[PDB]
Amino acid sequence: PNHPLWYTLCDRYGLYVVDEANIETHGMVPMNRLTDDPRWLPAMSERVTRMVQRDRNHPSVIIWSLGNESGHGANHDALYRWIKSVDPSRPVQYEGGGADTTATDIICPMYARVDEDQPFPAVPKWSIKKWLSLPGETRPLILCEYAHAMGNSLGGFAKYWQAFRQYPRLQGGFVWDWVDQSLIKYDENGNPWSAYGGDFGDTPNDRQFCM
Amino acid sequence: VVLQRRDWENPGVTQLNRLAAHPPFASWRNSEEARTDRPSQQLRSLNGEWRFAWFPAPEAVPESWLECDLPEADTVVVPSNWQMHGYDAPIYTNVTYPITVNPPFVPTENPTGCYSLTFNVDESWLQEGQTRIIFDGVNSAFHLWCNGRWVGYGQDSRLPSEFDLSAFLRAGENRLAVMVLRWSDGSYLEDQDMWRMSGIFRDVSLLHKPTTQISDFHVATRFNDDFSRAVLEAEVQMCGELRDYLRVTVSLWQGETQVASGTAPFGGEIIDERGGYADRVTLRLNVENPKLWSAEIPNLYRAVVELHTADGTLIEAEACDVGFREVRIENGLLLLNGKPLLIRGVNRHEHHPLHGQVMDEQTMVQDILLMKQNNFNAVRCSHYPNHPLWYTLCDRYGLYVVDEANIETHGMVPMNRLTDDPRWLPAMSERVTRMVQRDRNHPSVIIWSLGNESGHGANHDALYRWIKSVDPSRPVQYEGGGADTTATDIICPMYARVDEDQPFPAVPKWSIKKWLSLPGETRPLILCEYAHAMGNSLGGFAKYWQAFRQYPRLQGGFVWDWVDQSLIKYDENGNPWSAYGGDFGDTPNDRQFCMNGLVFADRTPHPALTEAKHQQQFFQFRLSGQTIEVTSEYLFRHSDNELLHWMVALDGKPLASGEVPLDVAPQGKQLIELPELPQPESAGQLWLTVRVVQPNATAWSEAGHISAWQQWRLAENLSVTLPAASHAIPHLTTSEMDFCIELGNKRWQFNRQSGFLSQMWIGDKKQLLTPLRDQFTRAPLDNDIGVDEATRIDPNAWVERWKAAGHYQAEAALLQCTADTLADAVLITTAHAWQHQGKTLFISRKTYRIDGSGQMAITVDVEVASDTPHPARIGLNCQLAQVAERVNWLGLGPQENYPDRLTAACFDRWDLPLSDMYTPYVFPSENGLRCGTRELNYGPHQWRGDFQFNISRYSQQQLMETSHRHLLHAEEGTWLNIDGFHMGIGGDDSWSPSVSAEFQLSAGRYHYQLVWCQK
Amino acid sequence: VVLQRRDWENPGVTQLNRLAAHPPFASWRNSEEARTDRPSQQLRSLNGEWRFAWFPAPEAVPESWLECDLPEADTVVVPSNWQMHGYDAPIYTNVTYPITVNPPFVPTENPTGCYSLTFNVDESWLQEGQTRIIFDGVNSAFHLWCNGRWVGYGQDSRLPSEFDLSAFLRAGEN
Ligand SMILES: CC(C)S[C@@H]1O[C@H](CO)[C@H](O)[C@H](O)[C@H]1O
Ligand SMILES: CC(C)S[C@@H]1O[C@H](CO)[C@H](O)[C@H](O)[C@H]1O
Ligand SMILES: [Mg+2]
Ligand SMILES: [Mg+2]
Ligand SMILES: [Mg+2]
Ligand code: NA
Ligand code: NA
Ligand code: NA
């Protein structure tokens, strides 16, 4: 969840908002190790519940998100239901565990391609055009992350928008992402330079991936 | 620190350093011991003699108690409830919380139980591996110290709390210190309608586990379409250092036969982007033609889970009983093994009259045996997880179980205040999740329940989905918030009626027949609670079973409830009496509302049990001329331990009997043709009776057990012969104050002032102590009373409608009293009015006809004002001087029966001791009635006609004025009540009028006739 | 006691004495102010110059800091990230946890940031009603004290933690 003023501005300037619970457990093995452990359900619920209690009156919030990259766990299903129950006015989405689980009203894959299947075991990233029409699938598809804007990038961006416009149930997505996460450091001359992972002696690091 | 935090007044702390929940462990170090479910050296009980001190609050606990035993502490048995030893009072309150409703705060005066144990610990336990202590039940919260150091803290009274003592114990002598608080924030979720007790009331034990251990295992059985093939899927999780040489073997056993086995190293399938569970493995075992588990045939297998090295060295083994069964709801039906269930269920609290809420194996077996012997096939763990042994016994004996999370917040306003509060979700989740983690492997558990009477809150929906997600094999049910909310797979109303809508706002109880077909509704309906068995009750129980049998989606319910929650107290003599709410100085209380059982606390049957047995029969019957059609309601088993006894009797006298073995397929039919039955010369009504008898003993029944019965009227020959013209003619002695009839040594005295038969004489012996008077009231039943109290009058209850109309203080006013000498008899015509405040309630018009044979033919005609509430009975009573040892009657019996609870009774000649004609309900009322009676014999007396009666040393007046059964005193002589008509007893609930229109005495005009004579 | 519980290593405890979450409040005592979303006298910002000291672990925090400003401490702007003032390094890591994966435990060397503020509360605030403190964002967990007395504890870095201070405050300096 964001600084409170953010929603006020989005209400006033006019932006659709996905409000995301502060739950990401990416580093776990497997990703859902905590989110499937019921002992961690309390800690997870307060992050989902207290968000809803804070932000539920803001018009700009149109979708609730259960968090990010925490696989799919039973805890997600319980909290999915909790939100649907407490606030019917907004869809609930969550990408973890393969982007189309029972914890999401929206097929929300990250970096799934327009035409090309990436058929990973357990958690495939189907081509977005194919994904929609998989046996028994009815839901809308909006990419929670796509078009990784890392350095010289957005190659093939037009291909997404041709798909979005042609396919009713392809309803767009959220580019990743808005702003480079670089910090200001200073050299011997006192000149500011853009710094990334590893420039603060931080290690292990993931270098320029913050940009 | 411990005093500073107050973890017992914080719903965000429910545990500190508590280990994970898991299914039953024993950490066997020998496979064969595991396979056979024999004792484990690694599971030590700490039950027995413990040290115990009591304090008014935790602040009054001396700091010394942690390191040194207190000399003032008495030695007591554990497990126990400390109220049962007398340290403070047990509180019975139904809905209203036993404490002040101020969450999360409990009283400052918080009764504290300071348990301590000095115990020996083997060195081999501490040199390697892990040693945990398991508290199966601590009510309601506790802190734990081992040798002076703090271990942890735990809540939820009805689930095992487990802590690791590995770093805490030393070899030789150790001391445990358990500080148990009576009230915690956990108490807010523990508001079940039962005795509020506390203490270490379930087993304490020590479990030793290797450092490399089985930490968890889940067993699943899926099937093909016809249940001829199964796949047993066992997921095993481990704790300890992962090694490549580590293996898990799951083997499945039917008796001594190994039916299947598989072995794999650790490392599950890829789950997501990060891989899989390295610390887990799943084993799949193919099973052909599995023997299916059901309550009808509890076929069980044994799974053994071996944690071992690849070179064959066993590290540890765990195990469990496995029932092959599929539970699913499809097309609106609850199916077990593809077959629609009919739940013959009961709610069962964990209650002992002596030991309180401590449970023992013997009591558990006794209940099971009784339930099964009375055609019960299912049980609801109202309203909390049970003693772990209970599920094992339901697995083995065959009972369908509803496992209920320990969550009840009945006293909140509104009921869902907490369960809709997201701050109470964590505490609620622990009670649901730890139940499922502990009990998920038991075949007998077929339905998960989210708790009881806590309205419907968002937390219920979240936990509903959680179970559906974690265990798809069982339906989830929850009654709260209207019985059909999004939190329940089953429409599970409590005390919803068969035909009658109760359209309460927001939470209506629709007639179960209407409920099913409400626009858009598709789910099955199984009453989570019905037929409230409070005192003289189960009126209209047959009406439920007629509906269950007729409507497919009506799949039964759970009677409320199994066992009276009375407690044993002792008088000045030292004699024991059954005690209820308020008998311990507890207040506010809800008196006898704790007593709703089909059996007494000692497990003595109530008359109602036999009604439940009859309606829950597994064989139905049709008579068509000479042919008996037997239909089995069994889903799986053939009638392979069943033979049909039949019996034709004429007014009690046997004429022909016989046996035919029953050979009915599940759900099938068998036609049985009766041999040409001999014609009887004499007058009367022929009655066919059939009984189903199990010739052979079972695990749950002795040989000769009667499982079902039914009766029909066959031919009736009406008496056309005139009784022989008697010689003697009785004489009328007309007096100023009396009419007297004389025949030999016999005399009848009719008082001309009152208008009643004041005395009868046989020679010099008087027959009556009180004259023969009309009666229109009864000692009010619990159903007549309801939640009506003197402190707050409910004017709608039967007892109050009656009281207000004057039924109980209505005085008889003579209107007519004449005598006439007939050709061969004397005729006494009388007329009475029962009045109150100028209102004529009832008019009784009578003729007494005494002829030469010495027979008094009483003809009674009663008018009942239409605007007076319908009376409890239209009858006669008197006190007989005689006291005989035997009561003998031709009518319904042997047991107590009322108009709306008489289907289980059979018409026949019955002979019982006078005591048996009285039912000892702990709260006294009308009792002992027998209906459809044509002849009653008591000592010299015989009464004939078509009437109902009870007979005892207890008057209606004494019964209605006496609060407890032990305060009752035999009066001089014998009180007799003979009713032409008697109002139903109801019982659909016990807090509103529940007697159906057809069983109310509403006709306005009523006629009956008696014949009185000496034999 | 705080040292002895270690609430930052227990997923069972995520808050102590924290008030219920709710939509944004200002507690206007005048309707027109509320209609126009103008500032509220009842909602004060405590942003600005706070006193700050850095410790390698919570164990390294002197008990004296509860009642006295530590002389070693610097004066810093709040809100801030103490990494941005240079007290320790920020860490950029994508997937791999910045700390050893051993739930629920964290490293014994746990960079502790000791923030303090001397501020004045008005008379009228304490005579009637309720005075709560709102921390809109604290990363990753914190214990609060007011005037030496312990108030509570909170987790979740991205949601406001609110605590009641009605009992804890005095008029003038706190
Ligand atoms: C490297 C992938 C396996 S994870 C990948 O890293 C990205 C780097 O910007 C983003 O954080 C994405 O959300 C994440 O899925
Ligand atoms: C009096 C009703 C409003 S509550 C009623 O009390 C009963 C008494 O045994 C049972 O506890 C029922 O479960 C409960 O619904
Ligand atoms: Mg608590
Ligand atoms: Mg209740
Ligand atoms: Mg914590
Ligand atoms: Na589109
Ligand atoms: Na990045
Ligand atoms: Na049925």
Ligand code: NA
């Ligand atoms: Na009760």
